[model samples]
Target: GSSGSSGEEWLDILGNGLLRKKTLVPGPPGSSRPVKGQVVTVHLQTSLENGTRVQEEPELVFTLGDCDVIQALDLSVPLMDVGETAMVTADSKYCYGPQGSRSPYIPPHAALCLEVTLKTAVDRPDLEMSGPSSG
Candidate 1:
């Protein structure tokens, strides 16, 4: 007894459940995605899987491919587009790893659930890659 009806589904990035995403607010269709070396901004909210509060960042800016942010965010950010908001749940492998944080007292091998809102991304100017204007 089943009808053709389903609710929002979580997107398993890479087709693996290790890193999953739930789109809270989808971005514009066909919006450009951030690339390596581009500077991107995002609203970050972190918490342990069991509801442990970590921190909330109003505006966290970092360049793509930079390790300034957590591994999960770094990997998920590029998958999101400007104005897109999503909840990314990653496993310990992509999170704190064998050792966790001490400031917020994140337990070792904690799988943090983070909500990230991509504000915007600025592309790095590429002189060589820029197409020449034809007469």
Candidate 2:
């Protein structure tokens, strides 16, 4: 019963109460997962635990393991596959910390909820081409 190891159970990633994730929509069969250095396109919505919407983006592009996103997000996105959606919860340590965010909508030590959908995970071909001095 709710072991958190199978199905849609929430699984703790950091083990320090910083981050947890629950799958909302599983990825399609045979879809590729993101790896370090790959570019992933996603849609994101962020809110407080009280369900106050903070931010929403229909499209966000970032390189896995390279881009500087929210701490909880950086740790959570890689766990998703293309076409997968998940809900991630982040404590203060993984969010804006004790100081909170600059938006004024978030308070200090506020726990955050993020709804993330991974659209695609692909390797950058330009980054892979060897011996390029076109500039």
Candidate 3:
């Protein structure tokens, strides 16, 4: 949809751009649900309703369905697939809400915009183990 547009400008300022290559394509409208305990790598940009870019860098790593991340992220990442990119607008109810966030970029009851790219998926391993495991 954004073909021929100035993507670099958007990427630099908004942190909302994605990779050009397609890895795992988003499944048809109704495909299998994304499983828990999967590791998903992504590039994302998070901004408030005022359009202030919060994250300086665009890429990050996350473990899906884990309690460690924001509720909105947990709820939304599954909707995408590896290489699939999307802009997610999260309401304050699903984000920092009145409690507020430690980050200065996120204010109370602020809506958030997240541009995401799912890069890879892998099974979750045991957390107690420190080193690589033999198959």
User: What C-alpha lDDT values do all the predictions have?
Assistant: 0.77, 0.76, 0.56
How does residue 13 of candidate 1 score in lDDT?
Answer: 75
Specify the highest-TM-score model's number.
2
lDDT tens string, model 3, 1-135? 756655332222213322122223455554344567776656666676677877743545566877445555655567665556655555565556666777654676677776666656667543335434699
RMSD of each: 8.2, 5.4, 10.3
Sort all candidates by TM-score, best to worst: 2, 1, 3
lDDT per residue for candidate 1 within 1-135, as digits (tens), equals 877655457777757777888878989987757777787778888888888878888877777896768777888888888788988888866766777767766676678889989877886432335433779
lDDT of 2: 0.76
Kindly list the per-residue Cα lDDT of model 2 for residues 1-135, writing each as its tens digit: 566546345778787656988889998888756787777778778888988988887876676786457777777788888888987898866777788777745688888898888887777543345433678
How far is 109's C-alpha from truth in model 2 (Å)? 0.5
Note the residue pairs that clash in candidate 1. Answer: none
Error of 1 at 10 (Å): 2.0
C-alpha TM-score for every candidate: 0.76, 0.79, 0.60
Residue pairs clashing, model 2: none
By TM-score, how accurate is candidate 2?
0.79
